[PDB]
Homo-oligomer: A and B are copies of this chain.
Amino acid sequence: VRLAADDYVGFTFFVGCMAMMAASAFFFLSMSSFERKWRTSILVSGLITFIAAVHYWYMRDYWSGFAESPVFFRYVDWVLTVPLMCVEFYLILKVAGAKKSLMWKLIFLSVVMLVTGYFGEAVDRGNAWLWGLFSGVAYFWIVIEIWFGKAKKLAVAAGGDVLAAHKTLCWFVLVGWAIYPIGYMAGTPGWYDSIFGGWDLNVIYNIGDAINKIGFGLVIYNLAVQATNK
């Protein structure tokens, strides 16, 4: 447990843990300065960074001990936080007339995506490409729903700050989340060892997690602020 200056994975575990901890405090402590109608979207942004702060604490210590970070262990957090992130689409479009049907659809797709991903990574690596494909289809459905589907139509109808927030969240989902499917292909045996594979993603995962989770919440927080100051 002596620290080394060249351990960049180590460094990014320490930073990521501290940034998520601070983000969780910022969202929980800000909630009361807003009208009740915004509070839930902010609270959930804080839950997302709270789960990640606590799991990053454990992973940071484990890396200090063993100098390993098994990818399957990252799913402890992803299986909870990715559905919560998908629920934020419902929370920000509820005013624009989203119905619980939307919430259930998103929760279902996100959970299928993460559980099939875990089966590919941990339970049945023989059939990792097949599990990948099931995960990939759930991802594609989520992307289609928010870029073109009902969620997009609701955002467009609302216009204003909401539409703006919606569009930014859609970029985070399209571009920010793409690192995870890529690392899956890099780390699992399949037909994609030719292209990817043998790539160290730990630094990318540690920085990506923080940007993905804190960025999502800052966009939601920014929406509450814009709306309130009008």
Task: Say whether B47 contacts A25, CB under 8 Å.
Answer: yes
Residues 25-39 of A, flagged 1 when their CB comes within 8 A of B and 0 if not, give: 110111111001001
| Chain B contacts for A31, CB-based, 8 A | 29
Within 8 A of B (CB), among A6-50: 6, 8, 11, 14-15, 18-19, 21-22, 25-26, 28-33, 36, 39-40, 43-44, 46-47, 50
Which of B21, B25, B70 is in CB contact (< 8 Å) with A3? Answer: B70
Q: Which of B11, B15, B28, B29 is A122 in contact with, Cβ under 8 Å? A: B11
Number of this chain's copies in the complex: 5
Q: Does A104 contact B (CB under 8 A)?
A: no
Complex: chain B residue closest to A32, CB-CB: B32
Chain B positions within 8 Å of A123 at CB level: 6, 8
B73 & A3 in contact (Cβ 8 Å cutoff): yes
Tell me whether A199 is interfacial, beta carbon within 8 Å. Answer: no
Q: Is A54 an interface residue (CB 8 A)?
A: yes
Partner of A80, one of B6, B22, B36, B55: B22
Task: Name which residue of chain B comes closest to A37, CB basis.
Answer: B33
Within 8 A of B (CB), among A75-113: 75-77, 79-80
Question: Measured between C-beta atoms, what is the minimum distance from A94 to chain B in Å?
Answer: 10
Is A195 part of the contact surface with B, judged by Cβ < 8 Å? Answer: no
- Bound complex: CA A171 to CA B62 (Å): 41
**Other A-B pairs beyond A19-B80, A22-B50, A26-B47, 7, CB < 8 Å:** A5-B121, A6-B123, A15-B76, A22-B47, A22-B80, A25-B50, A33-B40
